[PDB]
Design a protein around this ligand. Structure first.
Ligand code: ATP
Ligand code: MG
Lengths: 227, 198
């Protein structure tokens, strides 16, 4: 019943979820928008503070991507769905040219803070199919399923940039679609999210599961808004 | 002008771009200070309080300025003006939504000698025609600048301080009478002498 109410306000439960999610997801990606500045941008289309053009444009894009994710609930994660999310997210940035929007990487990339083996470009499309086919094979989608999906997706790292944000968008989508607790990956001075990721390995996602469990359920925190 | 042309990738060019865009954009309602505009142009960093439209239109004006310099000595056409307009209003809230112009352009290129009088008459007539819904003023000032540059004429930047002299000169003008505008432009300082040191 949470989802219906969320939809019927599309100040509102929707704007709270959007503001919180976008704030943390973008800040993890390096955005310098404060909570007040992001609120002002989302509500009144006014930019304040010091930002790169890319930060401004990508924050604005992230708003549209969030809307798309909510509008496309229950729809299948496909290659084109993911490429369109990426395309919306990096629209009108210094990555739009070169036409890396919205396209899988052609040149090897990396996640720094680690030397873990990222998927080579040629492996992106097949592994992703194997991942998607795996995801929809699950009888019941759980936080554990979503955590494994998240880690594997990030290890694939299909796009040259924006992998973190797109991954967390998809994670939010999966949670919403399966009436699971809404766990919003939050920024913090200690990099608990990143460290939980780095404690993980293929076949071992317990650090991420524990991290997600350590997060509060958004649905309960703002129960006053819907219940 | 040659100095202008080759300090392009590099500076007379950046000084002209910065000053011109500052005044042209401010007249159009931009809230970028001269420092904020400089920071945007040089480091692609946005500071201060601005609407999204202001940010985007300022960035666009940078691109349009570059295009205008690229098209020096090239003939003013309709598609050229439409390209300026499209570039200027790209990614704004203004995005969703002929004969008199042809006549004006041909009239302009028929003159054996281009003068400030010719440019002034062109400017007023362009504003009276008003070919675009928005950005008409900025496009007009871009074109005026182009016309001055192409003919080694004094480079006079319509200034934000100059209002409302510019506006009142425009309101005193009529078809066939452009003397208020000519006197106004004449009252403006020549960019070339101020930055002759460059
Ligand atoms: N040790 C790790 N193991 C697996 N994945 C990781 C690890 N560390 C980070 N990641 C994921 O890789 C993504 C890379 O993005 P990062 O945070 O490094 O900066 P960014 O490139 O600016 O963010 P974005 O990808 O949204 O553009 C992270 O968001 C994270 O989800
Ligand atoms: Mg990035």
């Amino acid at each position: 019943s949470f989802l219906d109410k969320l939809i019927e306000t599309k100040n509102s439960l929707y704007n709270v979820l959007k503001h919180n999610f976008l704030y943390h997801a973008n800040k993890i990606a390096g955005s310098t928008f404060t909570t007040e500045a992001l609120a002002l941008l989302l509500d009144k289309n006014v930019v304040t503070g010091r930002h790169t053009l890319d930060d401004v444009q990508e924050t604005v894009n992230s708003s549209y991507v969030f809307d798309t994710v909510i509008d496309s609930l229950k729809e299948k994660i496909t290659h084109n769905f993911l490429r369109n999310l990426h395309s919306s997210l990096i629209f009108n940035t210094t990555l739009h040219s070169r036409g890396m929007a919205g396209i899988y990487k052609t040149i090897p990339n990396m996640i720094l803070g680690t030397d873990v083996s990222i998927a080579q470009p040629f492996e992106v499309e097949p592994k992703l199919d194997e991942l998607i086919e795996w995801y929809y094979s699950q009888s019941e989608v759980s936080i554990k399923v979503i955590a494994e999906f998240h880690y594997r997706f990030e290890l694939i790292h299909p796009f040259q940039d924006g992998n973190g944000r797109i991954g967390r968008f998809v994670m939010l989508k999966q949670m919403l679609e399966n009436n699971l607790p809404i766990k919003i990956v939050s920024w913090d001075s200690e990099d608990l999210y990143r460290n939980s990721l780095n404690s993980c390995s293929l076949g071992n996602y317990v650090p991420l599961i524990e991290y997600l469990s350590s997060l509060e359920d958004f649905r309960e925190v703002y129960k006053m808004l819907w219940k």
